[PDB]
Write a protein that binds this ligand. Sequence first.
Ligand code: OGA
Ligand code: OGA
Ligand code: ZN
Ligand code: ZN
Lengths: 17, 17, 349, 349
Amino acid sequence: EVVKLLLEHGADVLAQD
Amino acid sequence: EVVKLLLEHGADVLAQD
Amino acid sequence: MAATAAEAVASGSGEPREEAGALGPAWDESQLRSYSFPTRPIPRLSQSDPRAEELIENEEPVVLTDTNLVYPALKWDLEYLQENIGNGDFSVYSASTHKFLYYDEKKMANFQNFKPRSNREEMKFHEFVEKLQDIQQRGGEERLYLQQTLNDTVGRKIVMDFLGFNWNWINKQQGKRGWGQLTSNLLLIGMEGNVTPAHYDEQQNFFAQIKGYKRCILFPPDQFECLYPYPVHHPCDRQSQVDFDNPDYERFPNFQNVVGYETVVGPGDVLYIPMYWWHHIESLLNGGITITVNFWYKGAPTPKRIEYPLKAHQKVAIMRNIEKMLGEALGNPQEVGPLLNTMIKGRYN
Amino acid sequence: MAATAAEAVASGSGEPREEAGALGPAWDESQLRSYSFPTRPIPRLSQSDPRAEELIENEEPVVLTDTNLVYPALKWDLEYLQENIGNGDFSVYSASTHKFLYYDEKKMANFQNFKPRSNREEMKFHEFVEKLQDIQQRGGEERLYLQQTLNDTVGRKIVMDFLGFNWNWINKQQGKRGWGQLTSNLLLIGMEGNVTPAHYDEQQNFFAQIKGYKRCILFPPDQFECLYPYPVHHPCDRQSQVDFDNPDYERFPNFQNVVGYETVVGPGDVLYIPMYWWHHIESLLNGGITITVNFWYKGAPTPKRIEYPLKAHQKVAIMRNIEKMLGEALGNPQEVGPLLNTMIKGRYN
Ligand SMILES: O=C(O)CNC(=O)C(=O)O
Ligand SMILES: O=C(O)CNC(=O)C(=O)O
Ligand SMILES: [Zn+2]
Ligand SMILES: [Zn+2]
């Protein structure tokens, strides 16, 4: 549960927005 | 949301169980 | 000189009170253990004094001198209890030193290298008293400390005394402070000189002193940086790692910035130990055995709307949860430290 | 001697390949910048080679020499693009040094003391080319680096070339690896010597080289301890704080344990930069302008069942979330560091 919460990732890259 | 999650407390004291 | 003013405000527990009927000074300053930090005194007020009501509301410690909380219990002593306490089992910790450091047994698994300095041994109250007499007889050095939650298995007299407690006053305190239910009543009977190292509990507490005298040294939750609690998963969770008799200033440098609020409670006094507040308890040297019964209450639920900036105890709540969550997520509590260090080294420190 | 064997395996990018028709050595070793750490070479394989398929599956870097991914684009150059790229705006970073450190503008708020060493300036492609010619003319020192996501506003020829990309091959790679959608295609045109400091992206990437040569130095996600990324809330989030030209070994001691995987990509080569992998990109010295178009894909969702122990990138995911959560919970990103330090000092470190 919380584990999945901590594992979820973003999609940020070397660009704005 | 997560803030409440982080704020929730336990009830542990100076005793077993 | 402000430094001189400060050296005065560090008046400790203050002048020993003079008991009724000129029965001499209650306790002597030489019955107190010496430490390396300053301490201002905790207020001694009347439950009718509005200030006392205020301190309890702002979750600040205060000693209530006239609550009559455990009035029926003020007649308790070994003989009485041995006849009335019942024949249920009693948790009794045995140690080779005055420090009785608490340790959660459920967590000893995650720390094999941990060897507790005191041992717990279930026994009957008469056995405890017997064992108490034996040590006295053989003039031994071993120390005992009875700590047992009061239950169904207490004699009718003990049950009767309970009824005589001032529930009216404490029930209101519970209701007015939004506190949860009463989870227990810990009976604490310890030998003279016995010490319960600094720690904090996750419940509100009304420390009702019954026999003998106890010196209570408290520290505000914002002094978390100066007390260095063991890792949450450690069996000594919620206890301070700092040895007060010998502070390791290299490992715990901020312990030199620590300032305590102390007081000596005696029969009839009720000390309010607010949730999260750190406290160090010691039965005065050569003061005989001590008897106390505390009242543990779950704290009020987290407010609907959170205000900022966060209060100290809230940050403590957060830091605890972080350690818990990480422990669960990594599948091994031993990996918590390595992750945290990796996260801050050269990044936040 | 194992130390000798290791000094050999640190063969860098290897021997420069000899181009077709004996057109001399592609690039010279003196076109590479000198650093203080060893680097083994990234494999150069054929897309039909089963090993290449394996490396991509285990999320390990690999250079695919024959994908024909951006085949139609291999004819791209300034003149062509200026005629066909369109008249939309193009993000162009301008700096006074070769290092072009990325910085998120949304996060500059939480860090007023941050002064970016390069500035972004929107302009038309012809202006960019013009400005490129001016610097060449005046023999200036200023450096430019065009980095723009390709959009609706590209000429029909550019759109036509796009159609000629090997979508068949990359679409399968997407499908077989469970990867999310293609979020963008960053066009990168930079001057010779330009450097994009070490960082990691949160998306899978197929780095398709089009013009000129680029040296790509990668580091595995398990080398997080040696690269010291800026705090998550910092505008330079996901970039390394370590100056590769001048490593501050006092602040970043573990940077001496760093080992990179490097390679030089040229027209036609496709480098797989796995999500979370750190990478340092530099346009060879005196190699002319470089042109690259990358393919960013969202990663596969988190598995239904989590296996242990956790992989490095998963721990990276966790450490990131912790910083995010704390930031939100404390209401101020500036309080994150103080809390973390308080949590570990004398407790876990
Ligand atoms: O009485 C003692 O020695 C210690 N008591 C407590 O820690 C408590 O009541 O919460
Ligand atoms: O091309 C560069 O100079 C830098 N490229 C990247 O960081 C990337 O494609 O993810
Ligand atoms: Zn990148
Ligand atoms: Zn306690």
